[PDB]
Design a protein around this nucleic acid. Sequence first.
RNA 1: GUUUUCGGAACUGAGGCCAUGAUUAAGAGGGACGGCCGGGGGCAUUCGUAUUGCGCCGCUAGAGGUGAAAUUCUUGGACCGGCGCAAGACGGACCAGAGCGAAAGCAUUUGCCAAGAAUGUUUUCAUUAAUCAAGAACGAAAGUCGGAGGUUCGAAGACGAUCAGAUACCGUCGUAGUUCCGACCAUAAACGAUGCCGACCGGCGAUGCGGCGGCGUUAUUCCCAUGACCCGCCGGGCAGCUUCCGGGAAACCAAAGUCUUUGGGUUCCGGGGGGAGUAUGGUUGCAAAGCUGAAACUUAAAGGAAUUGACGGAAGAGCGAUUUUUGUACACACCGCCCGU
RNA 2: CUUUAAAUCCUUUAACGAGGAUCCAUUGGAGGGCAAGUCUGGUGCCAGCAGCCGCGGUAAUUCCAGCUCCAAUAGCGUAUAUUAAAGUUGCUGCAGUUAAAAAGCUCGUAGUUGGAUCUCUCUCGGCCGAAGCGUUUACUUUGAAAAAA
Lengths: 141, 149, 73, 129, 82
Amino acid sequence: GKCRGLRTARKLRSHRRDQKWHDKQYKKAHLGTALKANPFGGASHAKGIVLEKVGVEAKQPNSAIRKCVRVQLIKNGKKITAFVPNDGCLNFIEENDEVLVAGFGRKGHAVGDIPGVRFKVVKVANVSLLALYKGKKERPR
Amino acid sequence: GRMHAPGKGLSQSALPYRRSVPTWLKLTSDDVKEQIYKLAKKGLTPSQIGVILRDSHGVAQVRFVTGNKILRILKSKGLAPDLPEDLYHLIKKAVAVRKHLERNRKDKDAKFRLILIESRIHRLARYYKTKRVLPPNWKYESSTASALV
Amino acid sequence: MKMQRTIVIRRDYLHYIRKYNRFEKRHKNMSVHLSPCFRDVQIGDIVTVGECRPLSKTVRFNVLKVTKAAGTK
Amino acid sequence: VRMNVLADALKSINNAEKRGKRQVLIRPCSKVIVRFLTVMMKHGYIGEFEIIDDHRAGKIVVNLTGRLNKCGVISPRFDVQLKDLEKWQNNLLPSRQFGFIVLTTSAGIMDHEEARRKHTGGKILGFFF
Amino acid sequence: PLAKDLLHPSPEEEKRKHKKKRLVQSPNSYFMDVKCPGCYKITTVFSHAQTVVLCVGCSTVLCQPTGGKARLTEGCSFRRKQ
RNA sequence: GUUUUCGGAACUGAGGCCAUGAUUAAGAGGGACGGCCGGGGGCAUUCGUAUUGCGCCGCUAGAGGUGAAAUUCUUGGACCGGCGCAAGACGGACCAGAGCGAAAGCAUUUGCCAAGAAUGUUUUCAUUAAUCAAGAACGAAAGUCGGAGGUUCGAAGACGAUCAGAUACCGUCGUAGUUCCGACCAUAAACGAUGCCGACCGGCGAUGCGGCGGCGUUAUUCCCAUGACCCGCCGGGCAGCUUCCGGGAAACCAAAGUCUUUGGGUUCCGGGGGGAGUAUGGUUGCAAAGCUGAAACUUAAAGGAAUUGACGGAAGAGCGAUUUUUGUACACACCGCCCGU
RNA sequence: CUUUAAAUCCUUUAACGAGGAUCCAUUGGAGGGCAAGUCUGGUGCCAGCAGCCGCGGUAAUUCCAGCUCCAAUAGCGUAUAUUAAAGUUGCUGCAGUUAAAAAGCUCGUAGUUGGAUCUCUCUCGGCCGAAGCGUUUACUUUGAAAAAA
Ligand SMILES: [Mg+2]
Ligand SMILES: [Mg+2]
Ligand SMILES: [Mg+2]
Ligand SMILES: [Mg+2]
Ligand SMILES: [Mg+2]
Ligand SMILES: [Mg+2]
Ligand SMILES: [Mg+2]
Ligand SMILES: [Mg+2]
Ligand SMILES: [Mg+2]
Ligand SMILES: [Mg+2]
Ligand SMILES: [Mg+2]
Ligand SMILES: [Mg+2]
Ligand SMILES: [Mg+2]
Ligand SMILES: [Mg+2]
Ligand SMILES: [Mg+2]
Ligand SMILES: [Mg+2]
Ligand SMILES: [Mg+2]
Ligand SMILES: [Mg+2]
Ligand SMILES: [Mg+2]
Ligand SMILES: [Mg+2]
Ligand SMILES: [Mg+2]
Ligand SMILES: [Mg+2]
Ligand SMILES: [Mg+2]
Ligand SMILES: [Mg+2]
Ligand SMILES: [Mg+2]
Ligand SMILES: [Mg+2]
Ligand SMILES: [Mg+2]
Ligand SMILES: [Mg+2]
Ligand SMILES: [Mg+2]
Ligand SMILES: [Mg+2]
Ligand SMILES: [Mg+2]
Ligand SMILES: [Mg+2]
Ligand SMILES: [Mg+2]
Ligand SMILES: [Mg+2]
Ligand SMILES: [Mg+2]
Ligand SMILES: [Mg+2]
Ligand SMILES: [Mg+2]
Ligand SMILES: [Mg+2]
Ligand SMILES: [Mg+2]
Ligand SMILES: [Mg+2]
Ligand SMILES: [Mg+2]
Ligand SMILES: [Mg+2]
Ligand SMILES: [Mg+2]
Ligand SMILES: [Mg+2]
Ligand SMILES: [Mg+2]
């Protein structure tokens, strides 16, 4: 049982402080290894240069080819696989282009069939993919 | 339960409700005190004196008759041992176990029991230091133990 | 009592932790100046000290009264 | 070892009340226990009790009326200010129409309402309802 | 069960309990006056004696200690006190 | 100017006087004492068959081993029967839901040495107590280093079988080891998978120890008294049956109860499944290894109890699904599931 | 005109100024969680959607569209840090037989916790004034001092 003495405040506080480290999220947030390993460095978005176009096979029981791009970030130079979400939006991206990339929605965890992909493309060549998809803006060229 | 055993016995004494000396007892306080002095001079601890008085002279409780305890009577007279009897018995038992153990090196149970006995000795010595019955430098050492008792 | 004309005393207290509604034991050490007028001062007796100007690097109090321990005979 | 006597007495009373017994024997006695039982009896929860006097710490025989739902002790005895009493009332009592918190104040051992009337704080001992 | 007068146990109830578990503690022992046939002196003996009791006048063994009670020598008579 | 008034401080003597000054002895704990109790511990001593080997004697061609055989030993007398001798290891039956020990663990007789629980107590002390960072003693088996012995068994190994294949299961040998002494090692499903101290809360019948009481049978040729039975009571102990005490997901538990009616004291310890008790640092060890002990990354479940089926080289009541025995990690239901190269 | 250093804006006021009052409201959704269509046309485990469960392999309530329908509204989606939800860090208030879990066992220092009991004062000065109080604390109730925002 727990100690209920009137002078046990140090014991209780010390025990709680030491047992908080067995929480996955607390340790992840306060240890610093996750922040060091995070390619974004704690940012919501980033800018990169499209190295190339790749196709990732969807995990079973689904069968598909998800269109992604390999890009390299400008601030740290790390290489990243980002997802281009829409029907035919991969034709809006060219090689050596500059793209804005955001997270996939699960805080560094993979989403859906796509294995090991945690980033998605937002803007290409300084125009949003939504505007290109809906035909509101054209590629600068 | 016991301090150093799992046993949880209940055997002990139950003093009567009445504190008045029974009518049949013809002894006075002075006669009881003289008997206590003679027994102490014979070389008996207060526990043995109380046992003898209970068994032979019909003295159920000296504190009820004389109004005082055996050890306090001895201290007032001056016939009291330097160190308390229970600590003396503990040290004597430790000495006996240590004398046995030196001739029997493979007796691990003797070593365990000696550790327990010395722990009890340390407890009692610390308690007696707190009450200033012992000087605040008295120490139990195995070599000195034989000479102490 | 090992320095020349200055001793080390200990002050004990309890610190309150609001979250748990409880206390923890804490202590502080003070180096104080002891005048030669106070003799027969032993370890473990109560001392009443008063504040003065800094007498040295770590001494700011002076012994004003000495009261013996409970075991005095 | 036994370190709280009021806790044992209240636990024994509660266990005997759950079983439908008519009387409870609690030992050892204590004047704190007597004050707590007097506070309970003034509100009609227990009834008359008798103190058996042996030459060592005494005993109590308590009559039961069947009106007691729960009697308990609070350990440790926390200091309660007069402005923090409503929080303990919300935490421990079942309703705002019945139930009492027992406090030891400098005026004596009483309930929380009597401590509000006399405008004093103290230390919480237990509760009953 | 659910109805028992704890204040007023029967006299047989309190002699069946353990000596410490009674309402008020009371020992199970007693003192007795013993007389040996050889010598006329009356000796007071505790029932649960732990020492051999010798007659002062004539050095006769009045009793022998055992585990629970002390057994009197053959031919010795005893009477309880009070 | 002296001393004495007055005032302040210190040291000596018997006085009077106090109701003269010690609360109780915990169904708390220590320490005495009494009769017992126990495969508890150490040392020495003693006995018992059995197994192996050796010596001699008798008659003999087989013996051993297996599902079946072979490797193996045998007219240089095997196996079997008898009479002795020697060594080493183990104490059968009695032996039990019995006892002791802190746990590992503990069983031939006798003696010595120290230790202990429980019971009995109108003995003594008077709070001396509970749990415990640091720090310590002990700690199965296996393993390591020196000595002594090496009967049996026997990792490794050599063979003979089986098999599609066996590097396994089976059989013949057989090295470390298994045994004792002295130093290390500190690990077990080291388990009741259940920390210790204290209080309360239903019945029943046994059982081990101590004590108390009581008709009656037996032995000590008589008498008490003490042993063996019988009927009860009390206190600790190992357990059992029963119960709508109450708990819990249930299995089940008189504790795993007295928990949203949530607080008796205190120690250790868990936070979805893997990576992983792995890497690295520190520390201990002769070594083997022991203690402390991550992260990157990966994943939507893994897991507990119970139910209905299907399989098997097995014989009114429950929260609820639900209402021949049994096991299941199967439910696309053994044509299953699943592990490692 | 007023406003103001001078202006601008707001307010006050002439004249003009609304029928498709075209002087046009958007952002996300329509399987469940969660409000709202197994309506029609394409595609056919492709393209794609989908925080999660899942949808799509020729009759797709989920993709691409049309129609219709929901939610908030001059606002509405997305990524990330953080709070509640979390009684999933538990002091209030969690667990440790079998789901993750009690050290192999014992001793023991520090720490934590600890059985009953016990119903203002002389003197000096003008009833109060000075002086000693309290064996001292903890507690509780007062009072004083405590920057604004
Ligand atoms: Mg699919
Ligand atoms: Mg202990
Ligand atoms: Mg005893
Ligand atoms: Mg709080
Ligand atoms: Mg022996
Ligand atoms: Mg032969
Ligand atoms: Mg035991
Ligand atoms: Mg035998
Ligand atoms: Mg340790
Ligand atoms: Mg071993
Ligand atoms: Mg070995
Ligand atoms: Mg060797
Ligand atoms: Mg073999
Ligand atoms: Mg062999
Ligand atoms: Mg282990
Ligand atoms: Mg087991
Ligand atoms: Mg375990
Ligand atoms: Mg029994
Ligand atoms: Mg026994
Ligand atoms: Mg018996
Ligand atoms: Mg709780
Ligand atoms: Mg985990
Ligand atoms: Mg993870
Ligand atoms: Mg039905
Ligand atoms: Mg029903
Ligand atoms: Mg099975
Ligand atoms: Mg089944
Ligand atoms: Mg829309
Ligand atoms: Mg649509
Ligand atoms: Mg929805
Ligand atoms: Mg709906
Ligand atoms: Mg899925
Ligand atoms: Mg179609
Ligand atoms: Mg369609
Ligand atoms: Mg939160
Ligand atoms: Mg909440
Ligand atoms: Mg979490
Ligand atoms: Mg609550
Ligand atoms: Mg939990
Ligand atoms: Mg487990
Ligand atoms: Mg265990
Ligand atoms: Mg301690
Ligand atoms: Mg107290
Ligand atoms: Mg301020
Ligand atoms: Mg302010």
